[PDB]
Amino acid sequence: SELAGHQTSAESWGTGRAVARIPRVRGGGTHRSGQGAFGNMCRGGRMFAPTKTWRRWHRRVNTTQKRYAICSALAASALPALVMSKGHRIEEVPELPLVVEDKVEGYKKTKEAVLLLKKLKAWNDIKKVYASQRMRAGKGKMRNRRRIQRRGPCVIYNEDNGIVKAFRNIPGITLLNVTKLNILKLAPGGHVGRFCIWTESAFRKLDDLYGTWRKAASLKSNYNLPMHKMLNTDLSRILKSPEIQRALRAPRKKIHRRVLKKNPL
Amino acid sequence: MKFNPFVTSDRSKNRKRHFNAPSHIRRKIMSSPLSKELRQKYNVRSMPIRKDDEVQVVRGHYKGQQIGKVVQVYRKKYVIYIERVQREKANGTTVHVGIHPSKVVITRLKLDKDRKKILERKAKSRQVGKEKGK
Amino acid sequence: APSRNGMILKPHFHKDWQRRVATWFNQPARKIRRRKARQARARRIAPRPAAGPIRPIVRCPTVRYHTKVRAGRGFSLEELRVAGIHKKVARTIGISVDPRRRNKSTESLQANVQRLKEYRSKLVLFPRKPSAPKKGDSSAEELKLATQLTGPVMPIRN
RNA sequence: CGCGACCUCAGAUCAGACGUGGCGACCCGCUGAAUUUAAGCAUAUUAGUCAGCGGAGGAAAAGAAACUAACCAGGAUUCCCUCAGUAACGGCGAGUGAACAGGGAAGAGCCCAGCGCCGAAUCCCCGCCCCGCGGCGGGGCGCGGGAAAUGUGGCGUACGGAAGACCCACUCCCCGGCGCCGGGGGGCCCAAGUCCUUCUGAUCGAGGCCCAGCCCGUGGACGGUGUGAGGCCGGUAGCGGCCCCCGGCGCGCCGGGCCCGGGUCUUCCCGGAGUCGGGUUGCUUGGGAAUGCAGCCCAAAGCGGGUGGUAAACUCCAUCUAAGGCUAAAUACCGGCACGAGACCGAUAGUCAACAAGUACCGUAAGGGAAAGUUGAAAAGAACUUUGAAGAGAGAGUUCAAGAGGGCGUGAAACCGUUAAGAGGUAAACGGGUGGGGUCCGCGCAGUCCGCCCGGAGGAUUCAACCCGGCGGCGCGGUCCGGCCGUGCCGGCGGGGCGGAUCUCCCGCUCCCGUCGGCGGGGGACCGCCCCCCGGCCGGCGACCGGCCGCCGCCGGGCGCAUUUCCA
RNA sequence: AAGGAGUCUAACACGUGCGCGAGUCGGGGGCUACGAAAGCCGCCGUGGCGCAAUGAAGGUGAAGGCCGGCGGCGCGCCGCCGGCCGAGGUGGGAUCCCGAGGCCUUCCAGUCCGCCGAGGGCGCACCACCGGCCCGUCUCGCCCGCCGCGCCGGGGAGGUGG
RNA sequence: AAUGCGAGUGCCUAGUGGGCCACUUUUGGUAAGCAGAACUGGCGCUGCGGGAUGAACCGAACGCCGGGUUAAGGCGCCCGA
RNA sequence: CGCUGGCAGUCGGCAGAGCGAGAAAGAGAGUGGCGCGGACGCUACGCCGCGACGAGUAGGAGGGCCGCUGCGGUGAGCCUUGAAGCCUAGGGCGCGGGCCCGGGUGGAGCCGCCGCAGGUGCAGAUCUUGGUGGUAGUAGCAAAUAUUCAAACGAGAACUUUGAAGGCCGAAGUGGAGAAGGGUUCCAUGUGAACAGCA
RNA sequence: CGACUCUUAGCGGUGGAUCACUCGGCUCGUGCGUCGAUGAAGAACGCAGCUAGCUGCGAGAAUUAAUGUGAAUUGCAGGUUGAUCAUCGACACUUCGAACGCACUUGCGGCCCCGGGUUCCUCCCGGGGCUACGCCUGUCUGAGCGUCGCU
Ligand SMILES: [Mg+2]
Ligand SMILES: [Mg+2]
Ligand SMILES: [Mg+2]
Ligand SMILES: [Mg+2]
Ligand SMILES: [Mg+2]
Ligand SMILES: [Mg+2]
Ligand SMILES: [Mg+2]
Ligand SMILES: [Mg+2]
Ligand SMILES: [Mg+2]
Ligand SMILES: [Mg+2]
Ligand SMILES: [Mg+2]
Ligand SMILES: [Mg+2]
Ligand SMILES: [Mg+2]
Ligand SMILES: [Mg+2]
Ligand SMILES: [Mg+2]
Ligand SMILES: [Mg+2]
Ligand SMILES: [Mg+2]
Ligand SMILES: [Mg+2]
Ligand SMILES: [Mg+2]
Ligand SMILES: [Mg+2]
Ligand SMILES: [Mg+2]
Ligand SMILES: [Mg+2]
Ligand SMILES: [Mg+2]
Ligand SMILES: [Mg+2]
Ligand SMILES: [Mg+2]
Ligand SMILES: [Mg+2]
Ligand SMILES: [Mg+2]
Ligand SMILES: [Mg+2]
Ligand SMILES: [Mg+2]
Ligand SMILES: [Mg+2]
Ligand SMILES: [Mg+2]
Ligand SMILES: [Mg+2]
Ligand SMILES: [Mg+2]
Ligand SMILES: [Mg+2]
Ligand SMILES: [Mg+2]
Ligand SMILES: [Mg+2]
Ligand SMILES: [Mg+2]
Ligand SMILES: [Mg+2]
Ligand SMILES: [Mg+2]
Ligand SMILES: [Mg+2]
Ligand SMILES: [Mg+2]
Ligand SMILES: [Mg+2]
Ligand SMILES: [Mg+2]
Ligand SMILES: [Mg+2]
Ligand SMILES: [Mg+2]
Ligand SMILES: [Mg+2]
Ligand SMILES: [Mg+2]
Ligand SMILES: [Mg+2]
Ligand SMILES: [Mg+2]
Ligand SMILES: [Mg+2]
Ligand SMILES: [Mg+2]
Ligand SMILES: [Mg+2]
Ligand SMILES: [Mg+2]
Ligand SMILES: [Mg+2]
Ligand SMILES: [Mg+2]
Ligand SMILES: [Mg+2]
Ligand SMILES: [Mg+2]
Ligand SMILES: [Mg+2]
Ligand SMILES: [Mg+2]
Ligand SMILES: [Mg+2]
Ligand SMILES: [Mg+2]
Ligand SMILES: [Mg+2]
Ligand SMILES: [Mg+2]
Ligand SMILES: [Mg+2]
Ligand SMILES: [Mg+2]
């Protein structure tokens, strides 16, 4: 509050009186009488530089960078090591672009969703969410953030025929539409590699929303896939290629440590 | 997950409305489960507890196979006094040990004109939900 | 005290500007309120277009914009008189009218007259009594295909 | 003299109404500083801001041009972006500082006076009759009363309007009741474990619940319950149910009103005065030979008047119509009622106030204004014995725990008491270097294992090599067969979608006689790119492979009967 | 013992990271539990900044050279129509290009793959300089245009201010 | 010519703008641990060995250590010699 | 700090184990006269090798696996078979900021890593609030002449009560009544916790 | 040896830090957006079986009626044809206060109607209803050497 610490009437006693020249509370037969009113050092009082509502809370990000981050988060979800290093239990998942059929959207009971997650061998991630359900540490428990858990697999659908109601009671499961993909849910915590389960109608609209490198995006106005700074990134195969290896000097891998100087005299 | 924008998930608000609830709301709060014999008969899972109900403790020090009549339903400390759950003081006077209604299960209801209507309302609204599911 | 090199800046923060600070934290709240009011109005006028009355073809003054064309406030009385529409009946069938406008030219006048004719050809008029049709109104086969238009009526394109 | 009008003015505890005062976050009308900055200070700046005064509403105010402009012109007001820190003002210093155009949110227009025409055609009140009757209304009577010609009502208002005649065209607009047809508030209720073992003082903990992967899940938000609960309970989800009340959206009927328009000619009519404007003075503005406002003086006109951002004269243009009035929406809201939420604070913090807080207390007064949360799961809050006058103890008892005993969770430091150890005449304390004594630790007190080989005592269902089956790796299988891809390249009696400032049969509308020319609108052709079918090579399958074949490796099962192999 | 003092907003400069790139940016508006988030609009790019400067302003507004023919001046110049070449040079300059000759195994010729190298070149960025072009201003001057022949308009050479 | 050393260049930028002391030169003053200059080195900003003590003097500048040797100073005892 | 040093060559029965040496460059190709074996490495933001150097106020920069609080992710993290906090003659690590274990106390939540955010670190400000010392059992309980004996009540008597004295105020009183102001202080009984600066 | 003093540790005091809790704040957002002469806001005084404060209420005084709900309230006593809670639309609502008969002592009235008193005869007592200012329309009673008309 902007009136906090300033609702009192107080003026400094000045020099003399063997007191430290701070403003003091006016008169009265109470405890608050010459007790120190203004300033950050005093009990009660006003804090140094009070926080204001017109702080810049919000940041704006360029649309091309938001789309670029969406592409980087999506391309990292089809790689084994990157989704393993996010911790998702996908050792028995049959294919990493996990694409299912279009009758999954017609699910209306969560038993069908649980059975589908078991047949896709994805139920061990929901088990890890269940094992990771615990209480928070600190002041967040008294600020309506009492219980925490792990973000589970993300299910991506094209049209909603009941799939959000069928899947929304499972802890960890989140639902995103294809045309409304969120970076905050595709890469939780800023780290790429979340486990994703697609449907085929979901999977067949990515080339329409983002395009390939020769065909532009059809549902966006003018967006192309970004260009690669480095086409072949496997520098091991680059370096031990005969094209590079012949144009090198001999390796000087002999270690020449210091010599103890004996006196020749 | 709660989607109603007029229902609160605030911890302090829920604790305030629980601890400052009026007496007719405390009656619904202080409900007790029915036994599995009465559950299959009435198709009713839980009822608000009354003064003349026979009831059986399932949790705490006084849990067992013993069944006691409720002495009183003291809704101010959110607790009931049952017939034989009691404690000697220093001087020798016995006082009733209070048990919460959620840790005690009803074995015999006191059937009034209103509590039959409550069981019938609960049974009809359960069968409407069963018909909606089926 | 000035530094080595920089601008001479004149910040207008010498009054009590912190009292009159307008924050925009209710901007996503007013967008939803405007959208709900817009949809409530669109449901209130059910076969009438959601944008409202038709706006005329209007040139812009003031030479930076004299090549562009625009939606004006209303059709002029000369335009309605050439088109054959009464000025107190035009507002009842969704034609925007203002009497302040003049017609200096001929080409814009006849363009707005053609604009009125093409809208009058597209107007599907319901009977005043639903149980009994009238003379100057649409037949029953068009009222069942009559829908609500979204966006401005006959949008103005350069 | 008296009587009767009218005018002007009184008095009524006359009949019926209205105002006062409060709150005041947001709004309107005044009044109005000085701190401060200018490194002084006086103009300026602070600032038309704080303080002061009056008046409202759910918004207020503004608002349908005496406008912007100078264009191929826009067209009420309010708000947002931009114009723009710009034009401009300024001891031209410090500093101050708009508007138009443009894009949006919203969008709604209207009425008088005058001038005229209609028999004042208009309005209010009292008495009676019936109805409505909880926002005092409707029709019917009254030789009932007033207001009003010093002007009420209808038509009519700057977008022109009125009247007559000529033509064309209207049979349906509004309100009030009667009765009937499908959002808001309130009340009640609706899934599934207290299932078996086990820790605890208490479990909501842990383990399990087979092939319905314990049960429900459109319900795994939250809270309570003796720690940490989707399944104990209230709840939550659900275009879930049931029961009342209010309102909207409509239909039929009754009693009323209203007795209506458009177009072309003809004849008429048309505007707001101590106001505009001018001088001067003072404040104000970015407004600068005066932007706005106000006092005083002067004081209008009607092809008039105002504006056209440099004073003035002449001459053209352009644009409105001042001095009367109403009007929703978009916009504002630190007060009030009811709610929801939080990368906020966590009892010296956060409101002064988590608590009998604007309270205790102080000042004559205006005013000033605190401190103050926590036993336990449950008072089970310590019966009884004994000393003392008692406060206080000692036993006993409760509790998981009194090492939780009514300001009682945890219980730090400063300071103090006692015990133990060590020491002591250069105040104490300190840095470096040792020594001594303690306190505990190494769970020390016969002291590291590891690999290979040799020797000696043993024990296995055992090695190599072959056979069968499975799997994996590699393959320049120089170039095996088949697929897939290409930010690869050429072709086609190929089919298609986007784009183009590359071109051109019907169609709307337009100038001139169904003929004849420009332009709004779909094809059609051309070009570019992409997608899908066809053939060719190239290149990849190391972000992207299948079957046979060849080699190698590993596993399992046989056969190996022990100079092999392994084990201690 | 506890609390206790370079914070937040706006503006500017410079450096650094990212994306796109002569463009870039939806911040305002609109569409469609967390979510008041995210997504989308392109005839919503209005508008801001950048792509053009200079002058107080009216205004103006960023290479030329050679040749042929014609006209004038007395072989050169000016004006006038057609062709061809064409965005400057000097010095330094990372890097890159050529290569006289050569880098051994018994001995010489002898082709390919590399590696070095005397000397010679195209020269990035950047710096110094000399030229060139645009706007203001000054001086000296001679010409060209037509719808209005003029107190009209346009040009040249040499300094100088931005 | 000798000797030695890799240089050149562009942005942004804090703190400071009270100083003081010494050999030599030197102004005013009888003089001053006074006032005011030039040059270089210090103190300020800096510990260490010595001058008993010590801002400036002499020597010498500093990461934590072991061995050896020195500078300026010293070597009766304090107190190493 | 510099060498803008070295290492992708771990090139293995599809093998041949090297680039320290005074002297620009190739352990180059072709053309004619048994035993199935071989340490470590390489978080390339990593590892390794040579030299030289190390003062610091005001000030500037870098690195913190230093520390506090909250958020997004992540540890199939820890926890009533005992979390946070606090105490400790215990064992240690780090140059340091600090941190990890052991014992005790306590009774319900807490932490590591990758990023994000800030009301984020105290010895001072005659700092603010709260608490506690030395002084110190010290200064002091000294204005207005004065108390003594016996008895009663009581657990307890210098101070209460009663009686007997000796005294003072000495009618402008230390007497008897009112106004202002106070508001139950008046009266009766009981108590001796706190107050009545001894009781 | 002991006293006194210093250091460290154990235990006990003084003190209430730290931590963990939170029916409280702060901030943002939404919907509504409602006071009063029919007496507001505010204040005063009273009201409970035992009641000081807070809260609630107004002589019907920790509430009456009605409706919903359905067996309690509770610190101790006492006593389903509906205890208690909630809703609240009926009724009631002391004194001051714009505060209203005049004043602010809680004082003085005036008019009218009732009941005792009396037997309409005024006293006296008690009860009820009126008695403020400004202002609008109408009514009634008036004023004027204001302007007139007529006897
Ligand atoms: Mg505060
Ligand atoms: Mg903590
Ligand atoms: Mg500076
Ligand atoms: Mg009256
Ligand atoms: Mg004023
Ligand atoms: Mg000043
Ligand atoms: Mg100053
Ligand atoms: Mg001053
Ligand atoms: Mg004010
Ligand atoms: Mg008022
Ligand atoms: Mg109001
Ligand atoms: Mg208004
Ligand atoms: Mg405007
Ligand atoms: Mg600008
Ligand atoms: Mg000046
Ligand atoms: Mg100003
Ligand atoms: Mg505008
Ligand atoms: Mg619009
Ligand atoms: Mg009239
Ligand atoms: Mg008008
Ligand atoms: Mg719980
Ligand atoms: Mg379990
Ligand atoms: Mg739970
Ligand atoms: Mg479970
Ligand atoms: Mg349940
Ligand atoms: Mg339920
Ligand atoms: Mg619901
Ligand atoms: Mg005027
Ligand atoms: Mg003024
Ligand atoms: Mg001014
Ligand atoms: Mg003019
Ligand atoms: Mg002018
Ligand atoms: Mg007007
Ligand atoms: Mg007007
Ligand atoms: Mg108005
Ligand atoms: Mg929210
Ligand atoms: Mg506080
Ligand atoms: Mg605390
Ligand atoms: Mg405490
Ligand atoms: Mg304990
Ligand atoms: Mg305890
Ligand atoms: Mg607890
Ligand atoms: Mg304690
Ligand atoms: Mg001792
Ligand atoms: Mg602190
Ligand atoms: Mg930059
Ligand atoms: Mg000197
Ligand atoms: Mg120095
Ligand atoms: Mg020195
Ligand atoms: Mg000496
Ligand atoms: Mg040495
Ligand atoms: Mg000596
Ligand atoms: Mg250093
Ligand atoms: Mg210690
Ligand atoms: Mg914080
Ligand atoms: Mg401190
Ligand atoms: Mg003494
Ligand atoms: Mg007396
Ligand atoms: Mg007396
Ligand atoms: Mg005493
Ligand atoms: Mg001690
Ligand atoms: Mg009372
Ligand atoms: Mg009742
Ligand atoms: Mg009832
Ligand atoms: Mg008086």
Residue numbers in the entry:
A (entry chain C2): 55 to 319
B (entry chain X2): 1 to 134
C (entry chain K2): 2 to 159
The paper states:
Here, our biochemical and structural analysis reveals that TTC5 recruits the poorly studied protein SCAPER to the ribosome. SCAPER, in turn, engages the CCR4-NOT deadenylase complex through its CNOT11 subunit to trigger tubulin mRNA decay.
To understand how SCAPER binds tubulin-synthesizing ribosomes, we analyzed β-tubulin-RNCs engaged with recombinant TTC5 and SCAPER by single-particle cryoelectron microscopy (cryo-EM). The structure, at an overall resolution of 2.8 Å and local resolution from 3 to 8 Å for non-ribosomal regions, showed that SCAPER’s CTD makes contacts with TTC5, the 60S surface, and an additional density that was identified as the 28S rRNA expansion segment ES27L. The other parts of SCAPER upstream of residue 859 were not resolved. In this model, K97 of TTC5 is positioned near a negatively charged and highly conserved surface patch on SCAPER around E1338, explaining why the K97A mutation is defective in SCAPER interaction and autoregulation. At the 60S interface, R907 and K910 of SCAPER abut 28S rRNA residues U2707-C2709, and R934 and R941 of SCAPER interact with D145 and D148 of ribosomal protein uL23 (respectively). At the ES27L interface, a cluster of eight conserved positively charged residues between K867 and R878 along an α-helix from SCAPER faces rRNA, although details of this interaction were not visualized at the moderate resolution in this part of the map. SCAPER variants with point mutations at the interaction sites with TTC5, the 60S body, and ES27L each failed to restore autoregulation to SCAPER-KO cells despite high expression levels. Thus, SCAPER uses its CTD to selectively engage TTC5-containing ribosomes through three crucial contacts. Furthermore, the region N-terminal to the ribosome-binding CTD would extend toward the 40S subunit and potentially reach over 300 Å.
